[PDB]
Design a protein around this ligand. Structure first.
Ligand code: 7HK
Length: 270
């Protein structure tokens, strides 16, 4: 009973404009949590976080206000960022990328199902727990696109340019779901080639023009096997209304290709 509410801040997990994130350890139980410290947008992040409950979404335990400073208690992910599992210019083994992509789809399906769009999917925002289970992180740019079963079209510029869908730069209004599908396709590209295909998806970007002209003999596409590449051809489609939806990604051949063995379990012989 005494001291269970006490947490020691043992190290910095992240720093930025928002403030900082510290790894906190319970004085009594030694449970590890991530505490987001915002100097003080944050009201919306907390409200969205209160809605979330899924195995592939960073869990929100609660918040505390100490005058001006807000403390967000979040699920600690000991495996760090997916970003650091991507070898520059190489990527990672295709069965690992497939497993992470399955868990990313489960997370995004969940959020879209409750009418939430993350709006900044990228490997820095995809964390790994002790068993390498992927968790969608940081709902600071997230918003509600569906309420009372009515879709709201988005118009605000949100995200990170290499991961943003082309409609965000070309259209005044756009559907939220194809934008998250697109960023997931860029994450899959990064996992399989260890590089981003373009600085941004605009016609003034030579690499983006090459892709629309189907020059897949060029990098990063040359490093990707034909089966995951065929999926990327359906995701990285400029027209968001013609882009593949998640129910159709779940039917894709590479998505359902057996590649990955289960977690290595202890065994003996004779
Ligand atoms: C001491 O470090 C380690 O042992 C390995 C490590 C490194 C970076 C992160 C984590 C773990 N885990 C997080 O849960 C984590 C939690 C939060 C976070 N950043 C956020 C920023 C803003 N909002 C939410 C999360 C990054 C994170 N990455």
């Amino acid at each position: 009973v005494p001291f269970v509410e006490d947490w020691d801040l043992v190290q910095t997990l992240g720093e930025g404009a928002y403030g900082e994130v510290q790894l906190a350890v319970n004085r009594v139980t030694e449970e590890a949590v991530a505490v987001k410290i915002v100097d003080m947008n944050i009201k919306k992040e907390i409200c969205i976080n209160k809605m979330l409950n899924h195995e592939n979404v960073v869990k929100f335990y609660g918040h505390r206000r100490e005058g001006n400073i807000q403390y967000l208690f979040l699920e600690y992910c000991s495996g760090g960022e997916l970003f650091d599992r991507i070898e520059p210019d190489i990527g990672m083994p295709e069965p690992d990328a497939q497993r992470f992509f399955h868990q990313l789809m489960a997370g995004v399906v969940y959020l879209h199902g409750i009418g939430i769009t993350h709006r900044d999917i990228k490997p820095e925002n995809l964390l790994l727990d002790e068993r390498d289970n992927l968790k969608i992180s940081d709902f600071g740019l997230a918003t509600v696109f569906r309420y009372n079963n009515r879709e709201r079209l988005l118009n605000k510029m949100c995200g990170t340019l290499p991961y943003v869908a082309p409609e965000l730069l070309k259209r005044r209004e756009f559907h939220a779901e194809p934008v998250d599908v697109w960023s997931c396709g860029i994450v899959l590209t990064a996992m399989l080639a260890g590089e981003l295909p373009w600085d941004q998806p605009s016609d003034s970007c030579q690499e983006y023009s090459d892709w629309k002209e189907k020059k897949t003999y060029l990098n990063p596409w040359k490093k990707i096997d034909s089966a995951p590449l065929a999926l990327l051809h359906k995701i990285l489609v400029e027209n968001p209304s013609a882009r593949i939806t998640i129910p159709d990604i779940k039917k894709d051949r590479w998505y359902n290709k057996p590649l990955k063995k289960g977690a290595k379990r202890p065994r003996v012989t004779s």
